[PDB]
Design a protein around this ligand. Structure first.
Ligand SMILES: [Zn+2]
Ligand SMILES: [Zn+2]
Ligand SMILES: [Zn+2]
Lengths: 262, 45, 115, 69
């Protein structure tokens, strides 16, 4: 008993589902947590040893921080802030290394597949850059003319999208409810006829259209929200949803614990 | 001594205080100081 | 230059607690609870779950300034009902609903084969 | 300068679709809209991220390296 879920489409990066028998506040809180509160791994620190490219050092550092990294086992990693090491260690970070040289007469593309994990992952499933396209080359980090070199070391910690958007695993989250406007939560702007000028949403097929003669239902509340969660690739989309629910539950549990302890 | 690079040749030179600032290989009078050896830290944000 | 550190949005600073409760003098049996390092995500959910309670006369929240991640929540209940108890019940209900939703979503996902 | 790693608005990773986009435009003679749709860019935020990019790094690559090894 509780909120009911029926998922229409499932993919490697998109899940389209219906969330019924739930409050609007709960659905919105889940959406916000999925956007902002899910921990993830991303490159945080960059030591540049050699950069003879045409791009600035912090330009490339910014690009590297935006590289999605595998975060399946991120819960086994610790935050650098509450780790007893000095700067970074193996219990709270993953160390990658990029080393590219322009030995070819044509432009040499530095991809994210060239990143090499140097730290000992200790059996975890974190750190590997996420590869999505068919060619097997990841994000296009940089380009090198002949003779140009780029040597650098990245330290990746775990963070959340609140601290910086590079840790966000959620991409866009479609969220809709009441496609027929039976709750009258919007007043449709129009010129001649509102119904004709406003295209029907794809979810209108999943609810009964209004009868055009019945009186306004002033007791009906908002439920049955159609939500489509996309994944950047750091974690599988189903894990995105599950970890969002877990994070919200942890927040409420922390509220309870603080209240009880005080 | 301190290391420099010819603006044109890209050749590496070592110059002292009394040395005239020119490229030995080509005579170019424009030199760029070499990259520092101390590590540089960048926040990836 | 004057920008604050982003971790101040969610990390409690030195010498401050997550919750502080102040009795309200405007109306009887009312409290105002300040939540630190929180925002709408928690406030709206808590307020709505409080409004589902039948013995809660008044429940509202506000984020006084976007710059600071904190919000105030005013709760007034009927006589003989501690507003702290109302907050506990709302939180327990939210946790139960989220657990049920997690179970249902896991079961629904396991039913898939095209993923 | 060089293709952005992620879409500014939603955060979809579009830095790995620049070469595929150029290949689709050149080799397959697809128009821009169909190529963008083929790559999976459906929201117009991502579509403007990839469609309006100007690849200036090529010009930067024409000048001889300052520090050549
Ligand atoms: Zn550590
Ligand atoms: Zn010279
Ligand atoms: Zn986008």
């Amino acid at each position: 008993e509780g909120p009911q879920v029926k998922i229409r489409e499932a993919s490697k990066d998109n899940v389209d589902f219906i969330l019924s028998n739930v409050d609007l506040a709960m659905a919105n809180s889940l959406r916000r947590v999925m956007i902002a509160e899910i921990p993830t791994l991303a490159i945080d620190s960059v030591e540049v040893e050699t950069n003879t490219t045409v791009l600035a050092d912090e330009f490339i550092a910014h690009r590297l921080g935006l590289i999605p990294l595998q975060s399946m086992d991120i819960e086994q990693l610790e935050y650098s802030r509450d780790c007893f090491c000095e700067d970074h260690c193996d219990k709270c970070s993953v160390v990658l290394t990029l080393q590219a040289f322009g030995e070819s007469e044509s432009t040499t593309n530095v991809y994210s597949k060239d990143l090499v994990i140097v730290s000992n992952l200790m059996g975890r499933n974190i750190g590997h850059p996420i590869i999505q396209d068919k060619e097997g080359n990841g994000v296009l980090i940089c380009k090198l003319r002949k003779g140009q070199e780029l040597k650098l070391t990245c330290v990746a910690k775990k963070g959340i999208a609140k601290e910086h958007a590079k840790w966000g695993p959620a991409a866009a989250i479609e969220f809709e409810y009441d496609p027929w406007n039976k709750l009258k939560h919007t007043d449709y702007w129009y010129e001649q006829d509102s119904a004709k000028e406003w295209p029907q949403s794809k979810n209108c097929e999943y609810e009964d259209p209004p009868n055009e003669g019945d009186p306004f239902d002033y007791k009906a509340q908002a439920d049955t929200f159609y939500m489509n969660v996309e994944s950047v690739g750091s974690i599988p989309v189903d894990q995105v949803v599950v970890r969002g629910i877990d994070t919200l539950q942890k927040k409420v549990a922390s509220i309870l614990l603080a209240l009880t302890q005080m | 001594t301190l290391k420099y690079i010819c603006a044109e040749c890209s050749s590496k030179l070592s110059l002292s205080r009394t040395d005239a600032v020119r490229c030995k290989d080509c005579g170019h009078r424009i030199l760029l100081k070499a990259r520092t050896k101390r590590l540089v830290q960048f926040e990836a944000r | 230059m004057n920008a604050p550190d982003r971790f101040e949005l969610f990390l409690l600073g030195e010498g401050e607690s997550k919750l502080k409760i102040d009795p309200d003098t405007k109306a009887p049996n009312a409290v105002v609870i300040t939540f630190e390092k929180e925002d709408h995500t928690l406030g709206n959910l808590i307020r709505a779950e409080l409004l589902n309670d039948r013995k809660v006369l008044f429940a509202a929240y506000k984020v006084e300034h976007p710059f600071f991640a904190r919000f105030k929540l005013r709760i007034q209940t009927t006589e003989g009902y501690d507003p702290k108890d109302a907050l506990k019940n709302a939180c327990n209900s939210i946790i139960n609903k989220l657990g049920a939703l997690k179970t249902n979503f896991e079961t629904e996902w396991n039913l898939q084969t095209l993923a | 300068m060089i293709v952005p790693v992620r879409c500014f608005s939603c955060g979809k990773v579009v830095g790995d679709k620049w070469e595929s986009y150029l290949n689709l435009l050149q080799e397959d003679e697809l128009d821009e809209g169909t190529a963008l749709s083929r790559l999976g860019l459906k929201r117009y935020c991502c579509r403007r991220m990839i469609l309006t990019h100007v690849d200036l790094i090529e010009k930067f690559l024409r000048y001889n390296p300052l520090e050549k090894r």
